[PDB]
A paper describes a structure:
PB1 domains are protein interaction modules with critical roles in the assembly of protein complexes involved in autophagy, signaling, cell division, and redox processes, as well as the auxin-response pathway in plants. PB1 domains form homotypic interactions via conserved electrostatic motifs molded by basic or acidic surface patches on opposite faces of their ubiquitin-like β-grasp fold. While type A and type B PB1 domains can form heterodimeric protein complexes, type AB members can mediate interactions with either PB1 domain type or engage in homotypic interactions to form homo-oligomers or hetero-oligomers. Our cryo-EM structures of filamentous p62 and AtNBR1–PB1 assemblies revealed that the presence of a tandem arginine sequence in the basic motif of type AB interfaces is required to stabilize a polymeric assembly.
In the absence of prior structural information, we traced the AtNBR1–PB1 de novo. This de novo-built model is in close agreement with the 1.6-Å crystal structure of a polymerization-deficient AtNBR1–PB1 mutant, which we solved in parallel. To validate our structural interpretation, we performed pull-down experiments using MBP-tagged wild-type AtNBR1–PB1 as a prey and a series of AtNBR1–PB1 interface mutants as bait. All interface mutants decrease binding significantly compared with the wild type, and binding is completely abrogated in mutants lacking the double arginine finger, in agreement with observations in cellular assays.
Numbering used by the authors: 5 to 92
Write the structure that this text describes.
């Protein structure tokens, strides 16, 4: 009953929304719904091949390319996610 805060950066612009979690701690969101939300926020195509990345605590970048990557945001008990969006 505690949501994940997601910040998304695109074009020098930061936007915030919150994503509900299930009792599992699993996000109530999949990659399609994430892309649709980001598309609505920045007037992009929801089916564009967007690079969605975040910087992990070990200094390595994580690319969100499938639902397993999003499942692992919760598995890792992150409470804040900052996603950088790049197009092309
Ligand atoms: Cl902020």
């Amino acid at each position: 009953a505690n949501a994940l805060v997601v910040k998304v950066s695109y074009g020098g612009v930061l936007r915030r929304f919150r994503v509900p979690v299930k009792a599992n701690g699993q996000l109530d969101l999949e990659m399609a719904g994430l892309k649709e939300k980001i598309a609505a926020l920045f007037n992009l195509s929801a089916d564009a091949e967007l690079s969605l990345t975040y910087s992990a605590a070990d200094g390595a970048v994580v690319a969100l390319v499938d639902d397993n990557d999003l499942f692992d945001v919760t598995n890792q008990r992150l409470k804040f996610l900052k996603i950088n969006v790049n197009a092309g």
